[PDB]
Amino acid sequence: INEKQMYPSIQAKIWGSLGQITDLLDVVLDSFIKTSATGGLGSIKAEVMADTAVALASGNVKLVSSKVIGRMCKIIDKTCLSPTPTLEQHLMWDDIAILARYMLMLSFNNSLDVAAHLPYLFHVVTFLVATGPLSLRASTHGLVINIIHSLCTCSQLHFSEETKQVLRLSLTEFSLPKFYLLFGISKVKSAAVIAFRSETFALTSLETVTEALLEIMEACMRDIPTCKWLDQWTELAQRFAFQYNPSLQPRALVVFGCISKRVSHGQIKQIIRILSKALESCLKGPDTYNSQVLIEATVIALTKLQPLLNKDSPLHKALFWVAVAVLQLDEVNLYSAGTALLEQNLHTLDSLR
């Protein structure tokens, strides 16, 4: 941190060599994260230590990448012990904010090798979209762009020319002015400029982003036949979907609904009981701002889950009346969700003749 002028040599000599020593990796990274936390997010120590992690990672990509992703996942999961309204208000928010930029910097040049961690990367992206200050939002966007880039430039997985064209198109699409709004970075000319320096979010946006990423993943699995990405990511979502939490669960429900390919009757029942409990807490509790968003999420999940239940499911018809009851609540966002659910239900029953 101190010898700024000699930096390009300091890193390449001390850190670039200590990285190639496989056994010391865990201790080095733990000290890195501790020193980053001590400085705090946005600190000179945090920035320097974030940059210095690229140097260590350059040696052993697999181990550093695995340790950096796994600790983020662990912190996110461990957030569900003392739930608080939002993540930005949670106690362990500083840890997530700090460890986020680690993946931001390690994203480039497949220093977060995609072909082993893509499900967890999309997990993080999904849980982080449009969170925190502007810098963190731009960081999440940059992470998405870099991960798609690396997947489009990974030599360890040969892809068809059609798949490569699809990926190139998707990278172009993620740069358009449309996604800047779906990512929370509005009125920012370049994501990069804001990212490398020291608003209400609607779940429809998360649905759009998650669908786009699902297309990006499915085009990839069209080449890697034995891939288990979809199952892994669906499971990691289903862990958070049905588990109570103030901040994570809303996002988790939409992500699960958009992601999953096959549902179960208990899942529909579990979601409906989640909506029931949310509504029951809304009438008694004064924190409507969270129960409402959870109700909307519950509805949005069903609007996607219904087209997948069995042709003999009695719940098809009950879904209509669920939608009617939702529309009876007289909330603009909830009404919109109900109307969407109604359209989906009518279409699904019509297709079933």
């Binding site: 992470l143 740069s175 990069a192 490398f196």
Partner: protein
């Protein structure tokens, strides 16, 4: 489709009434770039009436090497060829075109080509009985193949008659009275004819080479389908523009895309061209697209390390462009994009790319080192540390450019060493 881009700000509004997202997606691969009066007369006399063929029809001569694109308005030229055709456009005639000493500077634009095709009356084209072409070359082939869709109905017709030697054209001219200017007829006398010269390229052809006292000519003994008729190719490459010459091989020689040929008297050919070019050098009155490679590799590599994210991205894309264009064996990992968040500490990446490029492509190593040492003075302290770190991997390759007997190479190596000494 320039207007398709021009009106994308409003086309989406009408489409607001997948298809609905795809209009703006192609903007990634977009951003396209930005009676009559008459005066003057051609002192050059490009198009004129001269000579008559056996069939008793007038023949008009035309030398395309007299006119250069982008200098003289084509309206005047078309009205002029119409004016000189006024007494004869109402009757069937014959045309002969001279394609000697012809290059891309004689290319005819698509708009001017269609203006040529329209202004002449519809019956005058049917009046054309025969078209005679002399000294066809390889540039004309691709010129007309890119303009084939404009001339798709004319290939395969009897009107085109190929002439490679004056005898074939003179057969149908009364007593060989072809009135071509002496400038074109003076290039056939007393050259050297090589019978079995093999033209080495991607597609090997068996041609005949002619090196004279002023220029170098090559004719193709292999029939080439030009406009639907299999004809020979006569390419002329003057020696007044050849400055990349050296002794390379006993049976092969390098000429300038480089030109290579094999023959049993290649040394005599080289000596003849040397003599004529040195005579031309006696007659003198009182950046190239090769040195681009290293001089730009340095500009990309130094700027990657910069401390402005936009500049890093810009330089990365420049690297992708350079590697793709020049086919550098970097493992082809890099792919262009926009908006990449390239990390600040890219010292290891730049250094690894430099090492791989130095090992895989030890080609320039002199332009590159010259540029790096030149830019090492102006860089920052941190940038100086970066610069040395990737400069180091290249100095080893300098051993190669010491053994060669090229005083230009040796003096350059000495200059690089003296610059490094001054830096030390």
């Amino acid at each position: 489709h320039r207007l398709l881009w021009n009106n994308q700000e409003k086309i989406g509004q009408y489409l607001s009434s997948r298809p609905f997202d795809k209009m703006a997606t192609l903007l990634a691969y977009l951003g396209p770039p930005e009676k009559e009066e008459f005066k003057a007369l051609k002192t050059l006399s490009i198009f004129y009436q001269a000579g008559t063929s056996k069939a008793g029809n007038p023949i008009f001569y035309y030398v395309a090497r007299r006119f250069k694109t982008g200098q003289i308005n084509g309206d005047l030229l078309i009205y002029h060829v119409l004016l000189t055709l006024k007494p004869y456009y109402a009757k069937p005639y014959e045309i002969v075109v001279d394609l000697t000493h012809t290059g891309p500077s004689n290319r005819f634009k698509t708009d001017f080509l269609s203006k040529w095709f329209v202004v002449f009356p519809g019956f005058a084209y049917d009046n054309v009985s025969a078209v005679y072409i002399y000294n066809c070359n390889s540039w004309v082939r691709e010129y007309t193949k890119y303009h084939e869709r404009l001339l798709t109905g004319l290939k395969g017709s009897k009107r085109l008659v190929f002439i490679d030697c004056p005898g074939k054209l003179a057969e149908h001219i009364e007593h060989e009275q072809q009135k071509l200017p002496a400038a074109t007829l003076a290039l056939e006398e007393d050259l050297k004819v090589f019978h079995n010269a093999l033209k080495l390229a991607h597609k090997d052809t068996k041609v005949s080479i002619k090196v004279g006292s002023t220029a170098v000519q090559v004719t193709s003994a292999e029939r080439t389908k030009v406009l639907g008729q299999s004809v020979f190719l006569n390419d002329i490459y003057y020696a007044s523009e050849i400055e990349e010459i050296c002794l390379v091989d006993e049976n092969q020689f390098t000429l300038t895309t480089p030109l290579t040929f094999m023959h049993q008297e290649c040394e005599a050919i080289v000596q003849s061209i040397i003599h004529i070019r040195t005579r031309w050098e006696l007659s003198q009155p009182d950046i190239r697209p090769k040195d681009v490679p290293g001089t730009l590799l340095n500009i990309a590599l130094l700027n990657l390390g910069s401390s402005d994210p936009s500049l890093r991205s810009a330089a990365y894309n420049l690297l992708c462009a350079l590697t793709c264009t020049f086919n550098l064996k970097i493992e082809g990992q890099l792919l262009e994009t926009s908006g990449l968040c390239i990390p600040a500490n890219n010292t290891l990446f730049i250094v690894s790319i430099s090492k791989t490029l130095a090992a895989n492509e030890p080609h320039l190593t002199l332009e590159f080192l010259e540029e790096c040492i030149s830019g090492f003075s102006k860089s920052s302290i941190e940038l100086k540390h970066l610069c040395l770190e990737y400069m180091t991997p290249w100095l080893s390759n300098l051993v190669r450019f010491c053994k060669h007997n090229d005083d230009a190479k040796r003096q350059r190596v000495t200059a690089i060493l003296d610059k490094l000494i001054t830096m030390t």
